[PDB]
Amino acid sequence: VTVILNNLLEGYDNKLRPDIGVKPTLIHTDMYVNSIGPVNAINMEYTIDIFFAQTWYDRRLKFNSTIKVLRLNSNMVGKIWIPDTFFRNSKKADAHWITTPNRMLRIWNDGRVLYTLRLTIDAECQLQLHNFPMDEHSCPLEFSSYGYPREEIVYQWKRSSVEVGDTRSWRLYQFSFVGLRNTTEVVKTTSGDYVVMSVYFD
Amino acid sequence: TTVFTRILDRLLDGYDNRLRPGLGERVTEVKTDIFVTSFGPVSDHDMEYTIDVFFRQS
Numbered sequence: 001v002t003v004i005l006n007n008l009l010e011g012y013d014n015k016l017r018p019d020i021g022v023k024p025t026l027i028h029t030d031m032y033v034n035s036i037g038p039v040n041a042i043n044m045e046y047t048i049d050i051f052f053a054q055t056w057y058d059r060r061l062k063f064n065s066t067i068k069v070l071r072l073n074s075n076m077v078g079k080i081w082i083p084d085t086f087f088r089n090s091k092k093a094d095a096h097w098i099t100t101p102n103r104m105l106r107i108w109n110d111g112r113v114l115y116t117l118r119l120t121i122d123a124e125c126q127l128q129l130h131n132f133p134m135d136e137h138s139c140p141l142e143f144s145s146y147g148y149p150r151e152e153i154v155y156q157w158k159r160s161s162v163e164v165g166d167t168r169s170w171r172l173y174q175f176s177f178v179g180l181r182n183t184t185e186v187v188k189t190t191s192g193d194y195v196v197m198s199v200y201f202d
Numbered sequence: 203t204t205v206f207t208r209i210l211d212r213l214l215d216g217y218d219n220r221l222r223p224g225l226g227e228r229v230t231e232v233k234t235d236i237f238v239t240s241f242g243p244v245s246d247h248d249m250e251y252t253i254d255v256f257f258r259q260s
């Protein structure tokens with residue numbers, strides 16, 4: 001198995017995305033929300049803890065063998081190309097490093113890479129406090145690639161896009177979790193046009 | 203002494219830390235033990251509580 005990893009890493013330039021000259025790199029995203037933390041109306045923000053998973057294809061990481069899947073901890077996460085995904089409306093976000101880096105990397109023989117990590121995000125939510133305490137909100141959580149425009153990275157939601165746990169173990173003091181939805185948009189910036197995706201929690 | 207250094211230096215010869223023990227042979231069993239040196243304060247304003255632990259894994 002070490003031979004397979006050594007062969008995969010040989011002549012591998014992690015600075016270049018897969019299919020850099022051929023087509024956009026399609027990424028399939030999933031979220032499991034452990035807990036939407038408290039909504040801090042003073043600072044117009046809310047905390048959320050997620051397992052964020054991204055799946056893409058890397059032709060360079062194809063390997064022919066009978067193993068058919070390499071399941072790995074964070075050790076090789078820095079050794080290969082990873083998407084530039086970042087959360088647009090995150091005032092402060094942190095990964096988790098106790099006991100070890102809370103990251104997972106699975107590579108299939110056909111070149112499919114699944115990369116999962118645990119995140120805690122303090123996402124901005126501009127609450128319209130008219131009708132308070134009868135007010136209702138739809139707080140977003142947006143993300144996109146920082147550097148790669150739509151012509152280079154394209155995100156896609158899967159069927160089981162966003163999943164939630166019990167929702168009674170969540171830290172919502174004031175509000176009740178009404179519902180959820182997901183959306184995709186293309187946002188134009190000075191750098192270019194980026195495939196943004198939002199998850200709205202009502 | 204010399205034998206200690208020789209044992210330590212040659213220990214990681216041909217060792218791949220990317221692979222778990224007994225990969226493709228068995229299931230890695232881990233024995234866990236916790237010694238809570240102090241049960242820290244419980245915060246109602248956060249649904250958060252602190253706990254200082256000696257965490258042992260074998």
Ligand SMILES: *[C@@H]1O[C@H](CO)[C@@H](O[C@@H]2O[C@H](CO)[C@@H](O[C@@H]3O[C@H](CO[C@H]4O[C@H](CO[C@H]5O[C@H](CO)[C@@H](O)[C@H](O)[C@@H]5O)[C@@H](O)[C@H](O[C@H]5O[C@H](CO)[C@@H](O)[C@H](O)[C@@H]5O[C@H]5O[C@H](CO)[C@@H](O)[C@H](O)[C@@H]5O)[C@@H]4O)[C@@H](O)[C@H](O[C@H]4O[C@H](CO)[C@@H](O)[C@H](O)[C@@H]4O[C@H]4O[C@H](CO)[C@@H](O)[C@H](O)[C@@H]4O[C@H]4O[C@H](CO)[C@@H](O)[C@H](O)[C@@H]4O)[C@@H]3O)[C@H](O)[C@H]2NC(C)=O)[C@H](O)[C@H]1NC(C)=O
Pocket residue numbers: 074075076077078079094095097101219
């Ligand atoms: C101005 O100056 C500041 C600094 O003052 C600077 O900010 C600094 O930026 C750097 C990045 O440029 C950042 O370093 C990296 O940290 C990564 C790990 O986490 C470190 O941070 C976490 C959390 O930090 C955040 O914490 C708060 C929020 O939660 C808040 O303060 C901040 O947001 C802060 O960022 C922290 O928990 C970590 O603690 C430890 O655990 C790490 C585990 O990976 C370990 O690396 C650390 O050394 C550290 O462990 C020691 O300390 C703990 C106790 O704290 C002990 O328990 C341990 O025993 C240790 O004594 C870290 O502090 C880290 O992953 C990055 O490491 C990689 O760096 C490059 C990446 O390509 C490689 O060269 C490195 O080798 C390494 O990559 C390897 O490891 C990763 C992780 O497993 C793998 O995925 C990679 O594939 C790769 O693996 C390979 O190599 C290793 C050998 O190296 C090999 O073993 C493997 O097999 C494999 O081959 C990187 O170190 C730094 O933390 C940050 N400092 C701050 C903010 O305080 C600013 O940028 C400067 N200004 C500007 C604008 O430039």
Ligand SMILES: *[C@@H]1O[C@H](CO)[C@@H](O)[C@H](O)[C@H]1NC(C)=O
Pocket residue numbers: 157158159161180181182183
């Ligand atoms: C998320 O998006 C996918 C594809 O766009 C869709 O199938 C799914 O129903 C959406 N989730 C909702 C509406 O909760």
